[PDB]
Amino acid sequence: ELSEEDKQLQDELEMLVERLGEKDTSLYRPALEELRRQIRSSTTSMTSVPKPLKFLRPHYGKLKEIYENMAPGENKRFAADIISVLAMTMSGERECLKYRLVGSQEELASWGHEYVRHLAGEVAKEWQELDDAEKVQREPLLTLVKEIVPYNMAHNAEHEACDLLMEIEQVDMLEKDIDENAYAKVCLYLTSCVNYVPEPENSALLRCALGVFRKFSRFPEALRLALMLNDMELVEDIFTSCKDVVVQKQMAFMLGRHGVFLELSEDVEEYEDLTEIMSNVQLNSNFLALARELDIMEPKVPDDIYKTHLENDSARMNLASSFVNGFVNAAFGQDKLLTDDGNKWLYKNKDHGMLSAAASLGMILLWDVDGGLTQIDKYLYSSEDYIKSGALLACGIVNSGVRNECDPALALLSDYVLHNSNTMRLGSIFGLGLAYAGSNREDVLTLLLPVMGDSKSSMEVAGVTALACGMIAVGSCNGDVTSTILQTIMEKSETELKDTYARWLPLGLGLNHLGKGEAIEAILAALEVVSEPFRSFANTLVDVCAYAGSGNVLKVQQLLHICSEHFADMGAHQGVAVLGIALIAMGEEIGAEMALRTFGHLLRYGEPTLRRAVPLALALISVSNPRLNILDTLSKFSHDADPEVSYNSIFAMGMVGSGTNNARLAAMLRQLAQYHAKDPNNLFMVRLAQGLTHLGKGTLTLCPYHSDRQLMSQVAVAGLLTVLVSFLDVRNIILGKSHYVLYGLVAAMQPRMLVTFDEELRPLPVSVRVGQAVDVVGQAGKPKTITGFQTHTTPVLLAHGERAELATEEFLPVTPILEGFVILRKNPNYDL
Amino acid sequence: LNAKVRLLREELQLLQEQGSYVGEVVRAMDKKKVLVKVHPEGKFVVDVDKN
Amino acid sequence: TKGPDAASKLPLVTPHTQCRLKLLKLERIKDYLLMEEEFIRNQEQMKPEEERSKVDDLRGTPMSVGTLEEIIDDNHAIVSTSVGSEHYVSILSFVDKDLLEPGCSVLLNHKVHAVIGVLMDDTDPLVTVMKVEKAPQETYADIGGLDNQIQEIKESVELPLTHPEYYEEMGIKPPKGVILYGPPGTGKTLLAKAVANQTSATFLRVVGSELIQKYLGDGPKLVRELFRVAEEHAPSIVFIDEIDAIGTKRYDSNSGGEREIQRTMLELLNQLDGFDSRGDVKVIMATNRIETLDPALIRPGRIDRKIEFPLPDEKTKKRIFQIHTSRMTLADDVTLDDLIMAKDDLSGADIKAICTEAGLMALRERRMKVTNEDFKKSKENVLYKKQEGTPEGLYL
Amino acid sequence: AXXXXXXXXXX
Amino acid sequence: PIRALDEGDIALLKTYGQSTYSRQIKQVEDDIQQLLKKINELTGIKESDTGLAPPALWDLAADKQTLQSEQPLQVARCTKIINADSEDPKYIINVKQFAKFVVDLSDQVAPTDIEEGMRVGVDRNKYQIHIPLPPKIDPTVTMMQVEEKPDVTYSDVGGCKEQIEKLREVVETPLLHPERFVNLGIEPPKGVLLFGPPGTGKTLCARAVANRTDACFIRVIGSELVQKYVGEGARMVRELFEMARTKKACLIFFDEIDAIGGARFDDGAGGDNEVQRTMLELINQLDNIKVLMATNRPDTLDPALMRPGRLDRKIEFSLPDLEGRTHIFKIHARSMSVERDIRFELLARLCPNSTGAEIRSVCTEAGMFAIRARRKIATEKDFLEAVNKVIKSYAKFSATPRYMTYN
Numbered sequence A: 001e002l003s004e005e006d007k008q009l010q011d012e013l014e015m016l017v018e019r020l021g022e023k024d025t026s027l028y029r030p031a032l033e034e035l036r037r038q039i040r041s042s043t044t045s046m047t048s049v050p051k052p053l054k055f056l057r058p059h060y061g062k063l064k065e066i067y068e069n070m071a072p073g074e075n076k077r078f079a080a081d082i083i084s085v086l087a088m089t090m091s092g093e094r095e096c097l098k099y100r101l102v103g104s105q106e107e108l109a110s111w112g113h114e115y116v117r118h119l120a121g122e123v124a125k126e127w128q129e130l131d132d133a134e135k136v137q138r139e140p141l142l143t144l145v146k147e148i149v150p151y152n153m154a155h156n157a158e159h160e161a162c163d164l165l166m167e168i169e170q171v172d173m174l175e176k177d178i179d180e181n182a183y184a185k186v187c188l189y190l191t192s193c194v195n196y197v198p199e200p201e202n203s204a205l206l207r208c209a210l211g212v213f214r215k216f217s218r219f220p221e222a223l224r225l226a227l228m229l230n231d232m233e234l235v236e237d238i239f240t241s242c243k244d245v246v247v248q249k250q251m252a253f254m255l256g257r258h259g260v261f262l263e264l265s266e267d268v269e270e271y272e273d274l275t276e277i278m279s280n281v282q283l284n285s286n287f288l289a290l291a292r293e294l295d296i297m298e299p300k301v302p303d304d305i306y307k308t309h310l311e312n313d314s315a316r317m318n319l320a321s322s323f324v325n326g327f328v329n330a331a332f333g334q335d336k337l338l339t340d341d342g343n344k345w346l347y348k349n350k351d352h353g354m355l356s357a358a359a360s361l362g363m364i365l366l367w368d369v370d371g372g373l374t375q376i377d378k379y380l381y382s383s384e385d386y387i388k389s390g391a392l393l394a395c396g397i398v399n400s401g402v403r404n405e406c407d408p409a410l411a412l413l414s415d416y417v418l419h420n421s422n423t424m425r426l427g428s429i430f431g432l433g434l435a436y437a438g439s440n441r442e443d444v445l446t447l448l449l450p451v452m453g454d455s456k457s458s459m460e461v462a463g464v465t466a467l468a469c470g471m472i473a474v475g476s477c478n479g480d481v482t483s484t485i486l487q488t489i490m491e492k493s494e495t496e497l498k499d500t501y502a503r504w505l506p507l508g509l510g511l512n513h514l515g516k517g518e519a520i521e522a523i524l525a526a527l528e529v530v531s532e533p534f535r536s537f538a539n540t541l542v543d544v545c546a547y548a549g550s551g552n553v554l555k556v557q558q559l560l561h562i563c564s565e566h567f568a569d570m571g572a573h574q575g576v577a578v579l580g581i582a583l584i585a586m587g588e589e590i591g592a593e594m595a596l597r598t599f600g601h602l603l604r605y606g607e608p609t610l611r612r613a614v615p616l617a618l619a620l621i622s623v624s625n626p627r628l629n630i631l632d633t634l635s636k637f638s639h640d641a642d643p644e645v646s647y648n649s650i651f652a653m654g655m656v657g658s659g660t661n662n663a664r665l666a667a668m669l670r671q672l673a674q675y676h677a678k679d680p681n682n683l684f685m686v687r688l689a690q691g692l693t694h695l696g697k698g699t700l701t702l703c704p705y706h707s708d709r710q711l712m713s714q715v716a717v718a719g720l721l722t723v724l725v726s727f728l729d730v731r732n733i734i735l736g737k738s739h740y741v742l743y744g745l746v747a748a749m750q751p752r753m754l755v756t757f758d759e760e761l762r763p764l765p766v767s768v769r770v771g772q773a774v775d776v777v778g779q780a781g782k783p784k785t786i787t788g789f790q791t792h793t794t795p796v797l798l799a800h801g802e803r804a805e806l807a808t809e810e811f812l813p814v815t816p817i818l819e820g821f822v823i824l825r826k827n828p829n830y831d832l
Numbered sequence B: 001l002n003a004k005v006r007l008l009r010e011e012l013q014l015l016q017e018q019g020s021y022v023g024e025v026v027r028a029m030d031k032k033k034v035l036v037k038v039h040p041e042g043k044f045v046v047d048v049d050k051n
Numbered sequence C: 001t002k003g004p005d006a007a008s009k010l011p012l013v014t015p016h017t018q019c020r021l022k023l024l025k026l027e028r029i030k031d032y033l034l035m036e037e038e039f040i041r042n043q044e045q046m047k048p049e050e051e052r053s054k055v056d057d058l059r060g061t062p063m064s065v066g067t068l069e070e071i072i073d074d075n076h077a078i079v080s081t082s083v084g085s086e087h088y089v090s091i092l093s094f095v096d097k098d099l100l101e102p103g104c105s106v107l108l109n110h111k112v113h114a115v116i117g118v119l120m121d122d123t124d125p126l127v128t129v130m131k132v133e134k135a136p137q138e139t140y141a142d143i144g145g146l147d148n149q150i151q152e153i154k155e156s157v158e159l160p161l162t163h164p165e166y167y168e169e170m171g172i173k174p175p176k177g178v179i180l181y182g183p184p185g186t187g188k189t190l191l192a193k194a195v196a197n198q199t200s201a202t203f204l205r206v207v208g209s210e211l212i213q214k215y216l217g218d219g220p221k222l223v224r225e226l227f228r229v230a231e232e233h234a235p236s237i238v239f240i241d242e243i244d245a246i247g248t249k250r251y252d253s254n255s256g257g258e259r260e261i262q263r264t265m266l267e268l269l270n271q272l273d274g275f276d277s278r279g280d281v282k283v284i285m286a287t288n289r290i291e292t293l294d295p296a297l298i299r300p301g302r303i304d305r306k307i308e309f310p311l312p313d314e315k316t317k318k319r320i321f322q323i324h325t326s327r328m329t330l331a332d333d334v335t336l337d338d339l340i341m342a343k344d345d346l347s348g349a350d351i352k353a354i355c356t357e358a359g360l361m362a363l364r365e366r367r368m369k370v371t372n373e374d375f376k377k378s379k380e381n382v383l384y385k386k387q388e389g390t391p392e393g394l395y396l
Numbered sequence D: 001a002x003x004x005x006x007x008x009x010x011x
Numbered sequence E: 001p002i003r004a005l006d007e008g009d010i011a012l013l014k015t016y017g018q019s020t021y022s023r024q025i026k027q028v029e030d031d032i033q034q035l036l037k038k039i040n041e042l043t044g045i046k047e048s049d050t051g052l053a054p055p056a057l058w059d060l061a062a063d064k065q066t067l068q069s070e071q072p073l074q075v076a077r078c079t080k081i082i083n084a085d086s087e088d089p090k091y092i093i094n095v096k097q098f099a100k101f102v103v104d105l106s107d108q109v110a111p112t113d114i115e116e117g118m119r120v121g122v123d124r125n126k127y128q129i130h131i132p133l134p135p136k137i138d139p140t141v142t143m144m145q146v147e148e149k150p151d152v153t154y155s156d157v158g159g160c161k162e163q164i165e166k167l168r169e170v171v172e173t174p175l176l177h178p179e180r181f182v183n184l185g186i187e188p189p190k191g192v193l194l195f196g197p198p199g200t201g202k203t204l205c206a207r208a209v210a211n212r213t214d215a216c217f218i219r220v221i222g223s224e225l226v227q228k229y230v231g232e233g234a235r236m237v238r239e240l241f242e243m244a245r246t247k248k249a250c251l252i253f254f255d256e257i258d259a260i261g262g263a264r265f266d267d268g269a270g271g272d273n274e275v276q277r278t279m280l281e282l283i284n285q286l287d288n289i290k291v292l293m294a295t296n297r298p299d300t301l302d303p304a305l306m307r308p309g310r311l312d313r314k315i316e317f318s319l320p321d322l323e324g325r326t327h328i329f330k331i332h333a334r335s336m337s338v339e340r341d342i343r344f345e346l347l348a349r350l351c352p353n354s355t356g357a358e359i360r361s362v363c364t365e366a367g368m369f370a371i372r373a374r375r376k377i378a379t380e381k382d383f384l385e386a387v388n389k390v391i392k393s394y395a396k397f398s399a400t401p402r403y404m405t406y407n
């Protein structure tokens, strides 16, 4: 029951509700004033159950009707406030919202935080239920979001504040209400919510959250988002708006790390430095610089990696020998086998063996158009000039991941892209694609145009050719290149398609359409002309390339259906389908970790063609990421009976452990070698897996994600896709004549380091507490984003999923996210 | 009376069918086999009815 | 080696403030889950024989399970029926004369006893329930403080599985077997529940009273089974909580019942470090009384690291509070230092009762926001069972 | 002194 | 006055102040859980294959034949031969658990092939002896013998040279050179009962003897000798010792004798006497076969089993002296990545009254201190930090305030 206070309050409210029975003059103004006080007093209190609302369980029918008759002026409105507040406790939303809509205005703050939020929900609920059929109701609701949103901004309720605007579909106002003490909370939230949000709201959020970064002059943060939307114009403005050269310098280093090039006008000061920084010429000096501090300049040899001592010269295994002396010593600037006696080494490889070995010569020395190009002066012109493709890939590979003002790739390669010999051309187009991947340069794209139409070119020349064009125009949907690809793809004949290398033609179509699912509706329309199977296959694969990293559950559901189907011309469509889920889902950690379960189900409940793709699919999900659960999953299928699954699982292990130097993966890899010693095909690739797991002695990562895993690297996602899909048929492609395709990864090959330099670029060894990154979203205050701290004296290495923070407040980094090369600005606030 | 006899006659037939064993199912084994432990005797890989 | 049958943990959704970021992340998990169900169900439906069908006809139904004891000829073995008898059954062709091993559990034809199949994975229901499938949900960030204790328990059960190179590159053998001991309510089992939510290796659990069966050999034989499954499933951790139940100090007992418990300790004492050294099976014991365990069961070599869990210190008690008042709704006046500073030996389980109580003392006054008095009252209401016991004013 | 005793069960 | 929450009160508490996503979000979490539950059941049943051979090595046509012509034969033992007339023997056979029957041979067997006591196979129907069977090789006992020689050599057993020498004169020397024990006519002790504080080297001096055996080493579990069914403990003891006399140069190592060697006491009202009668079947058995035994607690052993008529020799594994602890250290540190200089002699005097194992954990913890801090060389400073955690950290209180009395 109640007490003297409670029972009396029940009567006092009871008298007030009852007295409104008649139309007495001193019953409407007097009573409604009392309800206004008591209801306001309790509701604007601690979370105490609003005694007025608990006692007041009356019906508004009498007052709602007389509301109209009883003084439609102020006396009418007053009743609305009392009934409206009583509505929030009950379930009368439509009426509960529309009372504050029509009733007395006053102000939202006067009622109570609990009331304000409830109106927030209903306002969002009504706005969503209100379509474009009429804005007449929108102006009032829009007016409400004008006042309430400022209410949340102050009250630590930015989450509801951002949540409130997102519900309305319109989030402009945050620009005008965010305080210097709030942009971090709001800007972080949108970046975290943007990935999950579907099209097109997700795109709108990125720009808006990007905009908020603008209003408070946090320029480097605007950079990360600008690329996330993958729109160059907003990048160019920030490039232009950055009146501070230092911020200009840094935002170029993030522009470069993404592989994004914007033609810099000479009006911009330090154009060469910005051009050289953007061209990534300074990368080589650091990489060698990084090595000297780390003491890893000495090159390695295959025998030590394999550890032949512990285990209880065919041309193939020589290739695996040749490859491991690639990746493992790649980018170190010196190899002990491919630089001194190479003519001797290659001569024990028959044709395609020569191709692979020669190409590794360029990958052994990346990012040196001079040193590598000078380490490119003893083979290519071989008595078996067939290996010319080998150095041509090395020629193209060296230019991959960098841009030189002298355009070496086109010069050397062009004279041989028309070379009649089929093998000579394979290196030309492929190597060229690596060098200018994502460049989208019209010249090289144009020069690659005749390659498509050159009928004399063999299909293997063609398949690489379309792939080469795709890798250049990755993520730009280049109308000319797409047209060339789109025009070229249609002209293909049915009989010539049935070959495996025709599997590469659609790949080039997508690689042009990576990251833009809006424009791929048309591209899938044009492809419908060609007849199946490759019509359906290209449709799926083109479909996947459209949604690279979108996080679109819809496409994944669409993609999962294709894999789910149980049918040979249908299995190519399936295999690209499973790899489809891997690419689409690999943006967010929440979804990506879930795709593992789906991948696992596709293996126990899968079929021949699917079971081969799953081992590859896991490869893209966790590239350079030795998650134990995934690495274990590849192993338990690393011995499988089907040769294709055994190979793909072994390759996946190599990718997952790429550059991680994971001891367990190595020990796991070594044991497999002993198990599969008999079969050269397994032993070759298990040996290869050990090769990928030591990429750059671990000083590189093929992960396509930078910027706290947020900023996607378009050119990268092109590479992994080529090898992975090309691995969809390993025996014809991998085990066949196309050992060179493994060089497709070189596009995404990037360094992972923590070298800290002083403001003058001298290495400034700063205590950097580096550990597993922990999200700061939704954590009030200054949450620690690093856990499992292990103070390292920079330079340092960050295994994937790690973040480094400057443990000394002596400096204030220009860019908030400490990845790659960061300009540490000495803190003016710090006092010794 | 007919409905009553039918109940009695049916219960006579059902009541001659031998009672069934009761054993703990250690674990499923496929889709048409389920390991069971009949109380006095040991393990048994029995089938499963269609129902 | 079937490989680590690690627990099945759904990804984690954080923010916890109940913001839309939370709803979206749960939806994404649900979306794939709905998608994943779709494939399982749409794989049986979309999915629409003459070799095996002949085999199943030779076997018939049912098929007995007795223990093989001798392979007399290539096509004859002696199999002991499920009652302890013997039988000179015939070995049919479909059986694999390789997996057939003395001691293996063989499938026998029911009418004419004849080896028909080898039943691997016959681990007792009493040890196959010991395996943790659904990983507990308390991550190392739910355990506050204990950074020195956690690291000690992360260098024997987590690190030796992720970066094995460090240990084998230095000559150590990763410490294997840690005795978590301390006063009641300090966090012994929570740190254990946290290694299961992070580890990628099969996490068997026991309660130190499950492995004492009534039968004379049922006891020592369940322990020999548990360490057979843990070894079988590759990387594994066996968590024998409340180890004081089985392994107390050996003594000349004049009671046969108590000589069978010790005949179970002297099995766990040999299934850990005895002839035929172990493989990769770590053991995490816990106990509130390390002063009664046998000097052998905690002799360095079986329990290498004796993590000691003292009652919370003042800094930890302040971190313990926030981990349990993270989801609460404290008013601006809730300055926790008033309660933490006290010299009361407030355990870490006491802190979560001073949180449950101070949140229920809020419903008393009809408030979902706990003020500062809601903790002062709760501290007293939650602080009994320990009263006040100490010396008088003798010491100055 | 006075000792209470448990017991097993030889099947 | 703790007013109970009125139903009117409850409605407000749960809706007033609710974050508009609360009902939806809590719905999403509830949906997932049920969804996960359903997900497992549709797939939880994982096929457990039943060990069928490859399709090539099948003879399904002949398989139907074996099941049809050949019949199951109960395995029995001939306990006597009546030899009614020497022409109609009328053998008596034991069916193990079934019963004892006076049976006669099926024509296939020869009257002279079934010798008294040998395992005999009978037919389910009449129990006529169809076939002789090889003597019983126990499935458990046969696995007991250590088929893979333990890797620990005698150079890994440090600080116990006089205790190893005392063992080598009972377990190795009288087995490789049975001429020094004959010239003087000394009867070799046919068993030693290694006792010592837990973790002093009892089972390492056991594996070491196994690596240099030249014999058949049987590792008695202790657990298997205590079986549920009555008597099956003793039946195993005999079937182990019997498996030794058959072999030449057999060593039996009963690790943890306390399991089945408890001091006798009348407890017949319980299964304990089942274990005791298994020891009395071992005491009879004990008193070319040498026997070893390890017991960290010898005082709980039956006085009868420790007499010098069964365990002729009792080697005491004491805590090492200083000249041995510096040797136990070097044995475990020969593979560690230590800095060349370590004053192991110094680390021996900081581990007073420390066993041969706690010296090992000092070496294992020493690195863990070198791994916590990224130094790949486990320097001396680490060990003193190691000896503080392994030995001192659990040795005693004996602390500064109570240790400023010693100088």
Ligand SMILES: Nc1ncnc2c1ncn2[C@@H]1O[C@H](COP(=O)(O)OP(=O)(O)OP(=O)(O)O)[C@@H](O)[C@H]1O
Binding pocket: C142, C143, C144, C145, C146, C183, C184, C185, C186, C187, C188, C189, C190, C191, C287, C288, C320, C323, C348, C349, C352
């Ligand atoms: N340091 C701590 N940080 C956070 N929570 C803690 C801490 N210590 C204890 N707890 C809390 O204690 C609760 C239960 O205690 P816990 O299970 O850890 O005890 P225990 O060691 O198993 O005790 P016992 O000796 O009774 O078996 C957990 O839910 C956890 O939230």
Ligand SMILES: Nc1ncnc2c1ncn2[C@@H]1O[C@H](COP(=O)(O)OP(=O)(O)OP(=O)(O)O)[C@@H](O)[C@H]1O
Binding pocket: C269, C273, C274, C296, C299, C301, E156, E157, E158, E159, E160, E197, E198, E199, E200, E201, E202, E203, E204, E205, E294, E295, E296, E328, E331, E355, E356, E357, E360
């Ligand atoms: N004296 C020692 N010398 C060398 N290593 C030792 C010594 N004592 C113990 N160890 C180490 O410990 C291991 C096992 O210890 P030990 O063999 O003494 O156990 P135990 O005596 O059987 O113990 P318990 O009697 O409780 O079963 C050895 O293999 C070795 O690694």
Ligand SMILES: [Mg+2]
Binding pocket: C188, C189, C241, C242, C286
């Ligand atoms: Mg506990």
Ligand SMILES: [Mg+2]
Binding pocket: C274, C275, E202, E203, E255, E256, E294
């Ligand atoms: Mg022992």
